[model samples]
Target chain A: PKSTYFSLSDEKRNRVYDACLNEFQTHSFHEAKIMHIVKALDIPRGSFYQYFEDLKDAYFYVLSQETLEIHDLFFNLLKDNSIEESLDKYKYLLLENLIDSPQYKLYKYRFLDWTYELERDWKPQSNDNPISQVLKSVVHNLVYRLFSENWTEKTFIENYDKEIKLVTEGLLNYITD
Target chain B: PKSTYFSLSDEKRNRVYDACLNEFQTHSFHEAKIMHIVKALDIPRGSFYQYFEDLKDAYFYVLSQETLEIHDLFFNLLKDNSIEESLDKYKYLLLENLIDSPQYKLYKYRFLDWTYELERDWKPQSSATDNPISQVLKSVVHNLVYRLFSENWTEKTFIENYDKEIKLVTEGLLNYITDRK
Candidate 1:
């Protein structure tokens, strides 16, 4: 998706990147438009398509750039730490980096109001990553809680501590690790 | 949304309902269209508006008619049984009523790929009622959904996983830690 984007001069590429970032940050994916991005960046209408397939591609590119990949949050930390250790530390890391970061609204749009068309069009970068499905479930549930309850940073921290213990220690112990 | 819809006679309403149901069953909310429904029903473009505010209203109305409300599935069971029993009973009930029923494709669309927009825009008919402790139960149901699509889980697999997860949640962390010791 970014082939032509990368071939552009560094300055020109940064301009387009900034334009997409700004548009996506301000508007939900459904509300975003290629025409607005082009108008804001003062680029030709056709040039937008040369860089990315469509508005959805631009939105996804911006998301990929802005947010930490969910797998990396668990797997990277788990490389050094046990499951309990990882969950204990990662809650703060997630809150500090995700919920309080400048990109929070962008993610909120994704979790709270992203459209079916966007979801239908998306494909994961890797389908066979080594991340355990249980670990993925833990993270997915946390995100679901955050969005469904509209959790604040404090509530997220408290709930993450309480809930991760159930999975890391409770479910793990029950099944006889 | 339904205030405009209820005035039609039974025959006219059934035709409109079937048209909407068939559209939603065949297409995702994003793909379902007022034009398609109207064309299939042989109704005028303006007449469709008399029935619904928009395609979304029609989509949501079809959903309300076709599927059991998620809350009712749990809350009704909880009143008569323990959490464990409730989860077990709900699984078979869900499978029989949803997966095995004719509305399977419609429910599958909901489970497999409905979007955040559809969720946010939706409102239940009633409000200010007591809800059961929903967070943990909702999470378990979500995993069932995730597995149903991702693992191609059979009705048996879905129920087994649902039963197992509910036990873990109900038992809590310290109980299992003690069991391990």
Candidate 2:
């Protein structure tokens, strides 16, 4: 547990946190080193173990800190909005948080290079509230497109707006053709 | 590269093919072993090498034979059908070919156990275009894959979900919300 690390002075703890995040950002999970984090933070090699089980633990912690789970984005939107409006909110929210925010590189690495082993080992801490299958399915496709195409902010907005509009306006309108 | 194996008599070739498919179906790619396949087929250890470079080559060839590219499924459907009808056709076609066929186990392994390294090394024989229609088709198939694994959906459940999601997209969320009101 990081109970000991959490007990440290805020300054010292932030240093350790920064070191871990920088190490992960600088290298892929496979290549990230505990040595670099400890050395950079000027903490004892043995003390790094006091804070995290290993590199995997530290990496997962940093990821949880930096990124918003997709479900969380939807869950909040559902508080006062219809499914239609929640989806409308998601398009811009995803663009701001995932593509243009400070967390973009971390998320990019996650989508582009994360291994199946990492995925198997990691469990999301938040329980996803049940949402509509249609919303989840459609939003997932948007995320897939963002990752596969490496879309710019402009491209993401343009495509997502159009695609979601198709669902909003109804495909029945296209049927006469 | 498997020209030597192809040159064998139809009886012998079918035997080798059956053994490989059975091995893959029984074990995931990581657990599947060349030794088990040869021993099961009663082929000599050296004869396996003469047929293919290694276990990966054999595995890839087996997968290639069993599965069609996602693009191939959509491309054919779009020819004579509208986008809506084509999607409907794809649901049944996917069920018949993937979930209900002998290939179900093989496709399951590909979905559940495939790794980035395996994907990086392997290439689909067919190339897909970059049009919006192709992109939408590919994205929908990817969602189907996630649902199959995460939801632990049966073929019937899978079809039902697919139909519902497609309806929402085609009919619009506004229609459903209005209907409920």
Stretches of candidate 1 exceeding 4 Å from the true structure: A114-150, A165-177, B2-4, B125-133, B150-152, B170-181
lDDT of 1 by residue, B67-165 (tens): 876657766777879656776687777778766787887877776656777877876664423111354456556656756755577887777666655
User: Per-candidate DockQ versus the true complex?
Assistant: 0.28, 0.32
- Candidate 2's residue-wise lDDT over B37-66, tens digit each? 999978788888988899889889999888
Query: What level of docking quality does candidate 1 show?
Result: acceptable
Once model 1 is optimally superposed onto the true structure by TM-score, how far is the C-alpha of residue A146 displaced, in angstroms?
A: 3.6
Error of 1 at B121 (Å): 3.4
Writing each residue's lDDT as its tens digit, candidate 1 over A40-101 gives 98879998999998888888888877876656676678789965687678887777776778
Tens-digit lDDT track of model 2 for A1-177: 378878989998888899998887777776677888889987689989999888898889999889877757877888889766887788888888887677777876676556546767877667321125545555666765686568887787777776666666666653445
Give the whole-model CA lDDT for all candidates, comma-separated.
0.71, 0.74
